[PDB]
Amino acid sequence: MHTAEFLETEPTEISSVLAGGYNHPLLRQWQSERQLTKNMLIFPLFISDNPDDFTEIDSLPNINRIGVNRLKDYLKPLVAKGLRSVILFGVPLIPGTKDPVGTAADDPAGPVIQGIKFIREYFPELYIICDVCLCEYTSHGHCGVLYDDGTINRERSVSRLAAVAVNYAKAGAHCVAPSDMIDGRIRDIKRGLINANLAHKTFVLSYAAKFSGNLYGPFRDAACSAPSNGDRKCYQLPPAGRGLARRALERDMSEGADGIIVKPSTFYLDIMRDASEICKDLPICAYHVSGEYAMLHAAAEKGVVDLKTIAFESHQGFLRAGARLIITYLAPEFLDWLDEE
Amino acid sequence: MHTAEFLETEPTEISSVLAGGYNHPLLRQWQSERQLTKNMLIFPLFISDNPDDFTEIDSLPNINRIGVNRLKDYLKPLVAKGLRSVILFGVPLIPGTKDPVGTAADDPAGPVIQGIKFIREYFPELYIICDVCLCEYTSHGHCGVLYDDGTINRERSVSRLAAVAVNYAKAGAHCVAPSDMIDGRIRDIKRGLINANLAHKTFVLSYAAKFSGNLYGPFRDAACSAPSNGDRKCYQLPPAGRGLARRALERDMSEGADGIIVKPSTFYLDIMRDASEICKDLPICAYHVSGEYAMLHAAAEKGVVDLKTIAFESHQGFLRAGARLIITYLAPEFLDWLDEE
Amino acid sequence: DDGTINRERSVSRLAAVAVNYAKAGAHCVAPSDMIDGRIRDIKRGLINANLAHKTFVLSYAAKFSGNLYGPFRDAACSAPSNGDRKCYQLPPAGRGLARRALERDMSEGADGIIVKPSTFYLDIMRDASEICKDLPICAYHVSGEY
Amino acid sequence: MHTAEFLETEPTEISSVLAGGYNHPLLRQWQSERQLTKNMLIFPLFISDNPDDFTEIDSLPNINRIGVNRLKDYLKPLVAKGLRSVILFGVPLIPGTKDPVGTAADDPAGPVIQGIKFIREYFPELYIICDVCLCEYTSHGHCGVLYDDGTINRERSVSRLAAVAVNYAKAGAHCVAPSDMIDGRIRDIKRGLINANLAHKTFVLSYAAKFSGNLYGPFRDAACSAPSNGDRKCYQLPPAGRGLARRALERDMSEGADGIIVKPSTFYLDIMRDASEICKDLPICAYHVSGEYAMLHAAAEKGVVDLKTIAFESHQGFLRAGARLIITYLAPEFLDWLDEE
Ligand SMILES: *C(C[NH3+])CCC(=O)O
Ligand SMILES: *C(C[NH3+])CCC(=O)O
Ligand SMILES: *C(C[NH3+])CCC(=O)O
Ligand SMILES: *C(C[NH3+])CCC(=O)O
Ligand SMILES: [Zn+2]
Ligand SMILES: [Zn+2]
Ligand SMILES: [Zn+2]
């Protein structure tokens, strides 16, 4: 009948034997080129012009639109658990705010700058990052200033963005993160900070490789940033554009970025590895975007994976691929989990 | 009052201007270093020893355990839509099959070899890949033969695996895909095919970088491959082990792999990029595993993403990262979609 | 008999000691002898003893001779008898020899490497970070440095 | 009972055998990629505006603050033992010297320029290097000119530094060594030497990688350069900043450095190796700083190490790491020791 056949084998070659390096729990930690720590985390905040706001963004599980009067009580526990950094997005809902050139983006009475002043006053040790763009402030929902045919106007757009970024830094932001993907905007932002005598204390964290695709969903609600007039494929990178992403990384580093962000993260880990070579002397940041985070939550409550397990697997994923910073909506969860681990 | 500030800007530098390369639909195709085609797809089949089986694997949406009498009617439409390759997994349910050394893995009456004979007879132009391992055939559910303390026995395990692989090739498999991750098994499998005069017609497709983690869920059901006695962390690579993965890629190529598989895929795209350098002269394959595929389905029916959109985004992801082959449960969907695209 | 090291018996003896520690329950062996080829034999011994799959070989692949070992010799009563350890400890200027020793021990089965001493040899750690980029690199802060 | 076990061994592999290259005293010299010679040494001098000064700097064993009338008798034996180079630091103690913009840094009556004129007259074959900075000449003790909030003013600072450096070269310095670490100062210094027709005979030796930390102690006394208003962490590099150091090396070479200094030395040898690649076509200099040198002396008189032995070990360390020049307070000792060795 049928029995187990065993082939005649040669002595073991040393070259074959990898197992001595990962047979114990502590070893699978020795095997990581970087470990996750609390100060690596950056938590997004969506700031309302309604100062009493604390509204659920139904598309973005466990995250709300908060106003300045409710921020202190929100951030206090977070800071106590070790949160070191926030990335501000403003969501101004008061009618008549939005205009073709994003005027309210750097309105001193606006949610972002008020947010910056609040946080500097009440949490002076908190590192403040501001998203720099016009899409939450424009009428058409696009990231820049447009010509009449609805295409982006590079020159006015970047001239406007430089202004907004410097104005955030003037207000007290420690770092500006331009998310517009419009050609050459980092040069102009850097030049504006230099002219304003702020380049020596403002970190330019460029979304240098921000891709177009199906993972932005939950955010647009969180920011009411739904476009008007077509899609953002003419400046967001196309998912297959590795070459364009490599050139964008090189470009933004040349134009003054102190750091770079790759967005989305899990679906673009190879681009993070690319970045780890091109921008080896710069901090690389992963942005765990709303669709990725929401995907994890859905699969979890469907029983496909465990939330905390897949959270650690994916965020360890970022560090493996070369990131040393992480923008994530699971930051509250990790400030808890990292005490145990 | 507050008006839009525009900073004084310099003339545009040519170095800044990337947009001329991706302003049109056809360009975002010109920008891909590889495009998805039908012959890149590899579809898994789970073959039952019940020849009348066509049972839903509830954890793996739209995929079933099929028996040989139902295979012809299943594969016929698939081949007609262009399917060129299958990867066989056997799921023997007849009691008393499973034994400590995986005896039934290469049982000529078993689902795999019967599957191989059926497919060679009825679909002679179909390229047949067989998963090579012992976990579906053992009592303890582990991928190899174990010592008494329950650790893996490298020597007997690899001696057994070499045998199974050669026996599949003797039966008519065109390609063997060892998924065991046990040190040096590719050398012995290659040596066995050479001794059996089959090395010249058998492709060795090594799971050279197969990682441990939370994404295997739905499969274990599909294959009834749930472990017994602890976890597979002592041979599956640990999620952070980039160094170990790089060494495993080099090793399996040195030991005779004609191609390599990275598994899982989306959560490990950086490893695919790593592989694209180390194994630049070899075909690289992505395995879209049951948990990843099930995650896409869940998020989709939750409204987070669109199924076909995120399917193309992720599978384009594999090609961008350097894969030129794709094992995926969405192969039926893509044989349809690629006609349009 | 002339007091030089005997490579063959030395390494045959070391392989034995290392495997015996692993047999006793050590998770990792760290050979600090710097005698040519000892990692191959230790690896081969663990393989023959069926322990290579659970024993990490952490080689002192770049251990240098010099003035920083002082306090240890007391701690271990390891003061030499018959000359110095310059014929196997690497000479402080031997960057080339250190690079070759790193490559060699990785080829012979090290799962990890140690550079010793540490602060005075940081450039060798950087060297190691390239040669042994896929392996854990360990610094030993030795008794004289501390 | 317990006897010595010897395992069965294989024949020796040639690949294992390194020992044939270092079994003799002469070989451990053949093994060095560079040997220490006398002309590699650079000796610091701290020049007093009291011309009769010869005051012990208690924190810096065996080194004094000397005035011009005592310099000839000090330098004469040194030159006779082979000293080829000095690096001048001025320590002006006459009250009312120090002012917010470092006015006295290039005072023709000041210790540095007087020192330059003395040495050119009395030791015309001596190569003169001058430290270029403002910290010994300012009221606040900082290395540059500051805005009102106490941060550094890049533009005036570098405009001032360029002036000081050119003025030293005008006085007769052969080399300028800017130690300020303020962004872009090498460009302006180079441009100033070019405009003054001195770029063709003035070596720019940039402290391109000068790190912040705990090793500067003994110097601050030697130079009375103790800060006022916080710390120098906003321009000195942070100890972990390898990326910033690599970029600073590239930058200063691009801006005109003919050579670079890494400071401190022993605790930063990996940065010297980094520099040996980035600046492979430039002389690399190690600065053995006051805290490192004082640490050697303390450990020595505590019996932990032997002074001459650890001196040769560390300074050989610099050459191994890629330096070919050494600024050190042990230069008197080595001019003696190198005759024997
Ligand atoms: C990106 C804004 N710049 C964030 C999108 C998201 O969903 O997280
Ligand atoms: C891997 C079997 N070798 C497949 C796991 C899955 O879920 O697809
Ligand atoms: C090395 C023993 N292998 C340790 C020496 C010391 O002083 O730490
Ligand atoms: C550096 C002055 N640029 C010297 C500091 C020391 O202590 O040697
Ligand atoms: Zn935008
Ligand atoms: Zn298996
Ligand atoms: Zn200074």
Coordinates of N, CA and C and ligand atoms in Angstrom, one line a residue, chain B residues 89 131 179 207 210 215-216 218-219 263 287-291 329, ligand 2:
Chain B
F89 N -4.3 22.8 -3.9 CA -4.2 22.4 -2.5 C -5.2 21.2 -2.3
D131 N 1.0 23.4 -4.4 CA 1.5 23.6 -3.1 C 2.1 22.4 -2.5
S179 N 5.6 25.5 0.6 CA 5.2 26.5 1.5 C 5.5 26.4 2.9
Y207 N 8.0 29.5 -1.8 CA 7.5 30.6 -0.9 C 8.7 31.0 0.0
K210 N 7.6 33.8 3.3 CA 6.3 33.7 3.8 C 6.2 34.0 5.3
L215 N -3.3 37.2 8.9 CA -4.0 37.2 7.7 C -4.3 35.9 7.1
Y216 N -4.1 34.8 7.8 CA -4.3 33.5 7.2 C -5.6 32.8 7.4
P218 N -9.2 32.8 6.9 CA -10.1 32.1 6.0 C -9.6 30.8 5.4
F219 N -8.3 30.7 5.2 CA -7.6 29.6 4.5 C -7.7 28.3 5.3
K263 N 4.5 36.2 0.6 CA 3.1 35.9 1.2 C 3.1 36.4 2.6
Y287 N 1.3 36.5 -3.3 CA 0.1 35.7 -2.9 C -0.9 36.6 -2.1
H288 N -2.0 36.9 -2.7 CA -3.1 37.6 -2.1 C -3.9 36.6 -1.2
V289 N -3.5 36.6 0.1 CA -4.0 35.5 1.0 C -5.4 35.8 1.5
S290 N -5.9 34.7 2.1 CA -7.3 34.6 2.5 C -7.8 35.8 3.4
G291 N -7.0 36.1 4.4 CA -7.3 37.3 5.2 C -7.3 38.6 4.4
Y329 N -7.5 34.9 -5.3 CA -8.9 34.5 -5.2 C -9.8 35.4 -6.1
Ligands
LIG2 C1 -1.0 29.8 1.7 C2 -0.9 28.2 1.6 N1 0.5 27.9 1.2 C3 -2.4 30.3 1.4 C4 -3.0 31.0 2.6 C5 -4.2 31.8 2.2 O1 -5.1 32.1 3.0 O2 -4.3 32.2 1.0

